[PDB]
Amino acid sequence: MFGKLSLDAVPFHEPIVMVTIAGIILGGLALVGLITYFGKWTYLWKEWLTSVDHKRLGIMYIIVAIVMLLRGFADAIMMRSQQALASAGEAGFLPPHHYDQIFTAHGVIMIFFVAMPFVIGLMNLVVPLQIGARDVAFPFLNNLSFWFTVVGVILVNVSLGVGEFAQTGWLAYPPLSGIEYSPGVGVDYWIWSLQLSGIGTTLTGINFFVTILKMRAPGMTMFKMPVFTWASLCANVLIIASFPILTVTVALLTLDRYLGTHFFTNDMGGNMMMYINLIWAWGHPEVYILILPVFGVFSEIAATFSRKRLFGYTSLVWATVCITVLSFIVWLHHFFTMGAGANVNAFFGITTMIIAIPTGVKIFNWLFTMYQGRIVFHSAMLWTIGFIVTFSVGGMTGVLLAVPGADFVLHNSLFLIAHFHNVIIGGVVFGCFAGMTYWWPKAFGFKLNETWGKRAFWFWIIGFFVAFMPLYALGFMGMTRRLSQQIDPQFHTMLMIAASGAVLIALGILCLVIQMYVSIRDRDQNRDLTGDPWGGRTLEWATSSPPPFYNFAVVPHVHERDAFWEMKEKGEAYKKPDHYEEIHMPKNSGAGIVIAAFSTIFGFAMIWHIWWLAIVGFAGMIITWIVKSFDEDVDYYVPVAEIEKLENQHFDEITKAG
């Protein structure tokens, strides 16, 4: 109502943004109408929105990541179509003013709100189950982290509705993203979205790091955990040691933009290059945060579907620890073209090359896990094989790019985009879909349709090759990134092929949606009765396919590496305990959503320079936190009756199915 906000902040004239806003608002209105009609408001509030259960927060991360993937891929389609039309000597349909917004928003969404939400969803879903714990160390902290991520997502989406988004790339390099050269409010949207998302992610990292070390099942030493728990611990260590760098960097840029300081300005002795260093000091650990958990997932799948013990457990854990250690001394490999001395460039090139060895070791351990096993061609196993094949080429191109000599001409070219898209699609989203199809029974109690899954996998891999292999050739031809208008016609053909690839990936995404739909429709015929659909090695498969809000009635005792496999081999897998005991559990808290709403108001007011509203929002956040610090009734006791009833129902299911 005050500040820069006015009737001119909404783009009336531009049709594309208005039809996008109409689509989003009608979708929201239809969802609200359906929820009201079914009267599930109370159930959603008391079971999902205020849930402190790790499984619910994991599923809700998966939902957020899936719904944001649609917006990301829509931006990808729009960019590819614009490039294809511009290559044919046409004006196209996307002015630079819109193309810059589109690619910046696409990058930010697909990095911060598609990959991290899905990966952290998988962690919340399985990590507490695998270690044999009932919940996480800080449940309310997990809920608050979820709501902070949702606040970031809301700010990014509402950026389209009112005002504009950043036009400075997904990392907002200082001189362009400065107050002098970017007078718009888009950079403020970027700043506050990433700040609040970073706060959420830091809290998540601390929570998981404490949970893994402190709340392990008795008799399970560090070198007896499942490999996914190792990868998650490494990723959380990276989050804790990295995200402060992003927080400080964005805080310095917003100080420059608001109070008119000279941290990164080109004048009054500001050092602009500093920002780049800092952001990349945070930038390169981030990608390992995306790639470490998915490795674990594949390891788990390699264990489950090869029907044999995983190869080189010690080698795998030492390789992931080596990756975690080396992922802090390699960031300069992002700007060899900045003009640093031969010594610094050579050193950073060599150290970036060194980290390749552990990844190769992990790939070879997976290959020898498939060596003399019985391989079942399930959806997850197809995802794993596709991941290995794609990620090998991705890593090859990466180590080629890590050489400063090659980097001097392949930097910011479509070769670099081919690299990072190649490795992301190969590892991150492949592991995401593999985990989603692999852990679906543990989240809902029924299996996914295999035919649609296989179709989606084939479409994804074929489309990815067709869309990104021409980008290698284009990068070789000298075509640079972020080109919108009057593209050299010599780059037309390859881009057209890329466009074909894009629509192929589209079909894959459509296939995925259809799969979920049919998986929901035919749930009554594909139920997971025994709780062990694929004979998984880890403890997570010991529980019923719908896990109780308490993960285990009795905390399991572990003596070996693969706990559940050893329990099945010994013949003691489903034994009725003599007696059940009252279980201490944490209560559902509603303060997370209140703090999230106050943070949303504060961020929005900061973006539009509504000072009083920002003060009100910040005061609301602090007051809600202080008030929730008072009450002591935060935990309750689950009685013996309910635990006995659920355990008897599960054992009856086991007996009838068995």
Next chain:
Amino acid sequence: GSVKTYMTGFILSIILTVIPFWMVMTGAASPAVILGTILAMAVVQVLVHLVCFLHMNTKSDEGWNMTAFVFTVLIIAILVVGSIWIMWNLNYNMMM
């Protein structure tokens, strides 16, 4: 910990704060010495604060009070030294 260790830490902190301040305000030595000695006294005071006041011990949390702190010190020694070195090189290579 006891009152005795806190009082000892307090006395050592008073000494390690007074000496550098008095040395700098008077220019009692060569600038190289006035830098090296104050950095040494600063790190000694940091260790005294960690031991006496923060009860920095190995046994607590089955050895994750040592490991976490040493790991973060290694990360700081990487990040700060790396940034300083990179910017020194990047500033030396753009002079006219």
Next chain:
Amino acid sequence: AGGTKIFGFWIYLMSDCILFSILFATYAVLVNGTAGGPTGKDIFELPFVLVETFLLLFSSITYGMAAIAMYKNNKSQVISWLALTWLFGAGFIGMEIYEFHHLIVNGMGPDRSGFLSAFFALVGTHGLHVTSGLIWMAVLMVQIARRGLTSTNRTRIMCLSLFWHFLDVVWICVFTVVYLMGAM
């Protein structure tokens, strides 16, 4: 239960160590940033920094005495020591605010040079950390006065001890690097 919360707060303090190390590196890069403006030697008053350091050290010692009294299962002693610690912290924040006001009024604000911007950023970050500690002490004292020394209260006191001693260590590093070394 207290163990997990204390370990979590320790990991958060390690994250905050990384946060402050980034600001230290930024200041070290932009230490000579100032162009046609005040330098370290021109504006840094060493007596003021010495008084600030002694008052924050007094705050740390008083809070330590509060922790010992809490181990002694006494409420009044803990309340008195917490009040003295909060008074010392308030004095320190007062001096920092006075220094910032004096710098801004004299046309030497964070918008004048890179060096001044970095100095303001680092000392301001420490200031907001100390004022967060002060608000935490206020809420903790008002909780103790109405709840007594419970397990949750003991856990919160241990976490605030870790936070306050960490802030004192950070201030030691700050006055060593920024104030004392600059005025050399």
Next chain:
Amino acid sequence: GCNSALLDPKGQIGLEQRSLILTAFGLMLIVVIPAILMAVGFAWKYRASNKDAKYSPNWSHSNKVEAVVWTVPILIIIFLAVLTWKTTHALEPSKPLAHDEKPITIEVVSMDWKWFFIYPEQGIATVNEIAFPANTPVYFKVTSNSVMNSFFIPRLGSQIYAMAGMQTRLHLIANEPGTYDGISASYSGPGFSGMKFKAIATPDRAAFDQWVAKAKQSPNTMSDMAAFEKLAAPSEYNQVEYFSNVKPDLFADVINKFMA
């Protein structure tokens, strides 16, 4: 692409960079190709359907296999890292080329959505075009009047950044006379697509002197900072322009605009 800009370069630096790319490609192939081949081989040969395939559900560790897995990557990284050190120390843009002919100094100021070039020795100025005789070293001193940009001629060789108030050095030599495309490799804003220029490697010196004389005939002059700022106005898809008279120290003044 066989006839690509990088795989068929015309400059020397391009030639060593292409050789380095091919050597690196060859070294990484020896490990990558077996990984994919073994992936497909183990997927097919050891499927659940096969009965004759040897089943080992307990073989989970092997010292020989682990040693073989660890060794080959280490050796490949050692060889390619030695090559990386040698090439990086031998392909620094901030390093004068070894050649008999004296280098020609070109100053590259990067205005918003256009390219500005100054020949101080020849005392001329150009917008979106350069020229230099073939088989002659060219010494680029690159700076940005504004937001970061990236000077890049794909066929000739290595790229560099242009940043405000900072001079960055680059060296390029053309082995074959002709016209080469030059772009910006750093997104500077809406007009970033606009940034495009042509490098003309003349067959002989005489053609270069003729081009310099033609530029000298331009009615427009760049003698004062006011004219420089008038040209520095935000404009998009700027045409090739010439300026006869240039201030002796214009690059220095452009850098000192930011007091650095």
